[PDB]
Enzyme design. Structure first.
Site, PDB file in Angstrom:
ATOM      1  N   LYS A   6       0.844  -1.211   0.000  1.00  0.00           N
ATOM      2  CA  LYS A   6       0.000   0.000   0.000  1.00  0.00           C
ATOM      3  C   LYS A   6       0.877   1.258   0.000  1.00  0.00           C
ATOM      4  O   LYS A   6       0.569   2.229  -0.727  1.00  0.00           O
ATOM      5  CB  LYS A   6      -1.001   0.002   1.129  1.00  0.00           C
ATOM      6  CG  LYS A   6      -1.889   1.202   1.223  1.00  0.00           C
ATOM      7  CD  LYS A   6      -2.928   1.132   2.281  1.00  0.00           C
ATOM      8  CE  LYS A   6      -3.793   2.362   2.266  1.00  0.00           C
ATOM      9  NZ  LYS A   6      -4.832   2.285   3.300  1.00  0.00           N
ATOM     10  N   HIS A  13       2.770   5.998  -2.589  1.00  0.00           N
ATOM     11  CA  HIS A  13       3.849   6.957  -2.357  1.00  0.00           C
ATOM     12  C   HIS A  13       5.109   6.751  -3.188  1.00  0.00           C
ATOM     13  O   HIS A  13       5.960   7.643  -3.104  1.00  0.00           O
ATOM     14  CB  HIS A  13       4.229   6.988  -0.875  1.00  0.00           C
ATOM     15  CG  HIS A  13       3.104   7.414  -0.021  1.00  0.00           C
ATOM     16  ND1 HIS A  13       2.503   8.640  -0.112  1.00  0.00           N
ATOM     17  CD2 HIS A  13       2.451   6.759   0.942  1.00  0.00           C
ATOM     18  CE1 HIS A  13       1.514   8.728   0.726  1.00  0.00           C
ATOM     19  NE2 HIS A  13       1.453   7.580   1.397  1.00  0.00           N
ATOM     20  N   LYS A  56      -8.663  11.901  -2.534  1.00  0.00           N
ATOM     21  CA  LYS A  56      -7.749  12.021  -1.375  1.00  0.00           C
ATOM     22  C   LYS A  56      -7.195  13.448  -1.404  1.00  0.00           C
ATOM     23  O   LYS A  56      -6.722  13.893  -2.448  1.00  0.00           O
ATOM     24  CB  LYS A  56      -6.641  10.977  -1.517  1.00  0.00           C
ATOM     25  CG  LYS A  56      -5.625  11.027  -0.403  1.00  0.00           C
ATOM     26  CD  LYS A  56      -4.577   9.939  -0.436  1.00  0.00           C
ATOM     27  CE  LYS A  56      -3.868   9.930   0.908  1.00  0.00           C
ATOM     28  NZ  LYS A  56      -2.585   9.197   0.946  1.00  0.00           N
ATOM     29  N   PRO A  57      -7.272  14.236  -0.305  1.00  0.00           N
ATOM     30  CA  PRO A  57      -6.943  15.667  -0.413  1.00  0.00           C
ATOM     31  C   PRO A  57      -5.476  16.044  -0.675  1.00  0.00           C
ATOM     32  O   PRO A  57      -5.203  16.958  -1.431  1.00  0.00           O
ATOM     33  CB  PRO A  57      -7.388  16.287   0.916  1.00  0.00           C
ATOM     34  CG  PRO A  57      -8.308  15.278   1.515  1.00  0.00           C
ATOM     35  CD  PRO A  57      -8.015  13.922   0.919  1.00  0.00           C
ATOM     36  N   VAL A  58      -4.559  15.303  -0.071  1.00  0.00           N
ATOM     37  CA  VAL A  58      -3.113  15.544  -0.259  1.00  0.00           C
ATOM     38  C   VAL A  58      -2.396  14.199  -0.350  1.00  0.00           C
ATOM     39  O   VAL A  58      -2.776  13.205   0.324  1.00  0.00           O
ATOM     40  CB  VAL A  58      -2.528  16.390   0.878  1.00  0.00           C
ATOM     41  CG1 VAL A  58      -3.193  17.755   1.024  1.00  0.00           C
ATOM     42  CG2 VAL A  58      -2.587  15.636   2.186  1.00  0.00           C
ATOM     43  N   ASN A  59      -1.364  14.131  -1.153  1.00  0.00           N
ATOM     44  CA  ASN A  59      -0.578  12.904  -1.234  1.00  0.00           C
ATOM     45  C   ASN A  59       0.796  13.224  -1.785  1.00  0.00           C
ATOM     46  O   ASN A  59       0.893  14.040  -2.710  1.00  0.00           O
ATOM     47  CB  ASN A  59      -1.247  11.892  -2.147  1.00  0.00           C
ATOM     48  CG  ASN A  59      -0.609  10.534  -2.093  1.00  0.00           C
ATOM     49  OD1 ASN A  59      -0.695   9.843  -1.064  1.00  0.00           O
ATOM     50  ND2 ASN A  59       0.057  10.132  -3.165  1.00  0.00           N
ATOM     51  N   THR A  60       1.838  12.560  -1.303  1.00  0.00           N
ATOM     52  CA  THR A  60       3.189  12.744  -1.811  1.00  0.00           C
ATOM     53  C   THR A  60       3.694  11.487  -2.497  1.00  0.00           C
ATOM     54  O   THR A  60       3.561  10.380  -1.970  1.00  0.00           O
ATOM     55  CB  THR A  60       4.111  13.140  -0.666  1.00  0.00           C
ATOM     56  OG1 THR A  60       3.603  14.332  -0.078  1.00  0.00           O
ATOM     57  CG2 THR A  60       5.535  13.348  -1.130  1.00  0.00           C
ATOM     58  N   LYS A  65       3.733  12.443  13.701  1.00  0.00           N
ATOM     59  CA  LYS A  65       2.686  13.424  13.995  1.00  0.00           C
ATOM     60  C   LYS A  65       1.619  12.864  14.926  1.00  0.00           C
ATOM     61  O   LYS A  65       1.050  13.654  15.702  1.00  0.00           O
ATOM     62  CB  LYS A  65       2.039  13.895  12.687  1.00  0.00           C
ATOM     63  CG  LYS A  65       2.904  14.862  11.901  1.00  0.00           C
ATOM     64  CD  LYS A  65       2.358  15.151  10.550  1.00  0.00           C
ATOM     65  CE  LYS A  65       3.086  16.245   9.843  1.00  0.00           C
ATOM     66  NZ  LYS A  65       2.633  16.270   8.449  1.00  0.00           N
ATOM     67  N   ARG A  90      -2.068  18.198  -4.428  1.00  0.00           N
ATOM     68  CA  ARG A  90      -2.943  18.982  -3.530  1.00  0.00           C
ATOM     69  C   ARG A  90      -4.257  19.328  -4.240  1.00  0.00           C
ATOM     70  O   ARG A  90      -4.213  20.006  -5.260  1.00  0.00           O
ATOM     71  CB  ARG A  90      -2.285  20.300  -3.107  1.00  0.00           C
ATOM     72  CG  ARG A  90      -3.225  21.205  -2.330  1.00  0.00           C
ATOM     73  CD  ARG A  90      -2.644  22.562  -1.974  1.00  0.00           C
ATOM     74  NE  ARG A  90      -3.153  23.054  -0.704  1.00  0.00           N
ATOM     75  CZ  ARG A  90      -2.599  24.049  -0.007  1.00  0.00           C
ATOM     76  NH1 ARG A  90      -1.529  24.671  -0.468  1.00  0.00           N
ATOM     77  NH2 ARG A  90      -3.118  24.424   1.148  1.00  0.00           N
ATOM     78  N   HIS A 126       3.882   4.213   5.965  1.00  0.00           N
ATOM     79  CA  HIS A 126       3.134   5.489   6.063  1.00  0.00           C
ATOM     80  C   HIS A 126       4.052   6.646   5.697  1.00  0.00           C
ATOM     81  O   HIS A 126       5.233   6.608   6.093  1.00  0.00           O
ATOM     82  CB  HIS A 126       2.630   5.618   7.498  1.00  0.00           C
ATOM     83  CG  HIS A 126       2.145   6.954   7.892  1.00  0.00           C
ATOM     84  ND1 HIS A 126       0.807   7.260   7.764  1.00  0.00           N
ATOM     85  CD2 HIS A 126       2.786   7.991   8.550  1.00  0.00           C
ATOM     86  CE1 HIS A 126       0.678   8.508   8.151  1.00  0.00           C
ATOM     87  NE2 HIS A 126       1.897   8.915   8.728  1.00  0.00           N
ATOM     88  N   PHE A 127       3.546   7.599   4.922  1.00  0.00           N
ATOM     89  CA  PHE A 127       4.279   8.837   4.652  1.00  0.00           C
ATOM     90  C   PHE A 127       3.791   9.925   5.610  1.00  0.00           C
ATOM     91  O   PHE A 127       2.646  10.295   5.576  1.00  0.00           O
ATOM     92  CB  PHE A 127       4.084   9.262   3.211  1.00  0.00           C
ATOM     93  CG  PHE A 127       4.994  10.369   2.773  1.00  0.00           C
ATOM     94  CD1 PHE A 127       4.704  11.709   3.055  1.00  0.00           C
ATOM     95  CD2 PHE A 127       6.196  10.076   2.154  1.00  0.00           C
ATOM     96  CE1 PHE A 127       5.600  12.704   2.684  1.00  0.00           C
ATOM     97  CE2 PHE A 127       7.083  11.067   1.809  1.00  0.00           C
ATOM     98  CZ  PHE A 127       6.794  12.371   2.111  1.00  0.00           C
ATOM     99  N   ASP A 128       4.656  10.369   6.513  1.00  0.00           N
ATOM    100  CA  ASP A 128       4.233  11.288   7.568  1.00  0.00           C
ATOM    101  C   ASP A 128       4.346  12.765   7.159  1.00  0.00           C
ATOM    102  O   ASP A 128       3.466  13.541   7.547  1.00  0.00           O
ATOM    103  CB  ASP A 128       4.982  11.057   8.873  1.00  0.00           C
ATOM    104  CG  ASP A 128       4.164  11.435  10.094  1.00  0.00           C
ATOM    105  OD1 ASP A 128       2.953  11.098  10.136  1.00  0.00           O
ATOM    106  OD2 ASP A 128       4.734  12.020  11.047  1.00  0.00           O
TER     107      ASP A 128
END
Length: 124
Positions: free
Chosen positions: A7, A12, A41-45, A66, A85, A119-121
């Site tokens: 995932k 990512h 999805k509102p934000v993703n890197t 976080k 974004r 997870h991307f923090d």
């Protein structure tokens, strides 16, 4: 079921491009990586480095996550990334994004054996 490691790769990792390809990139990638299926999805890197180089962050600088957990790690080197974004006018299912490239240190959460990113923090 999709694994947590898989995932993270889907959401990512984008090693095939060195940088936020084009102004179209987040529109295409948020859709193709299935991040617009149930909602925008509102934000993703996305990270433009090798899988080995991102995995190696789990052995780098331990920082607080976080969410207050302790299993986050900051890359010593900067990495090429693209932040996506959602635009103000974006309405599901026609999810629209702004594409902005950066070179930043990444922060990932790691878990498991092997100990890998799940997870991307943040980027800093």
């Amino acid at each position: 079921k999709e694994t947590a490691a898989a995932k993270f790769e889907r959401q990512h990792m984008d090693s095939s491009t060195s940088a936020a390809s084009s102004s179209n990139y987040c529109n295409q990638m948020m859709k193709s990586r299935n991040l617009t299926k149930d909602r925008c999805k509102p934000v993703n890197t996305f990270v433009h480095e090798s899988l080995a180089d991102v995995q190696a962050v789990c052995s780098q600088k331990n920082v607080a996550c976080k969410n207050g957990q302790t299993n986050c790690y900051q890359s010593y080197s900067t990495m090429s990334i693209t932040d996506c974004r959602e635009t103000g006018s974006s309405k599901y299912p026609n999810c629209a994004y702004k594409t902005t490239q950066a070179n930043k240190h990444i922060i990932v959460a790691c878990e498991g054996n092997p100990y890998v990113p799940v997870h991307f923090d943040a980027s800093v």
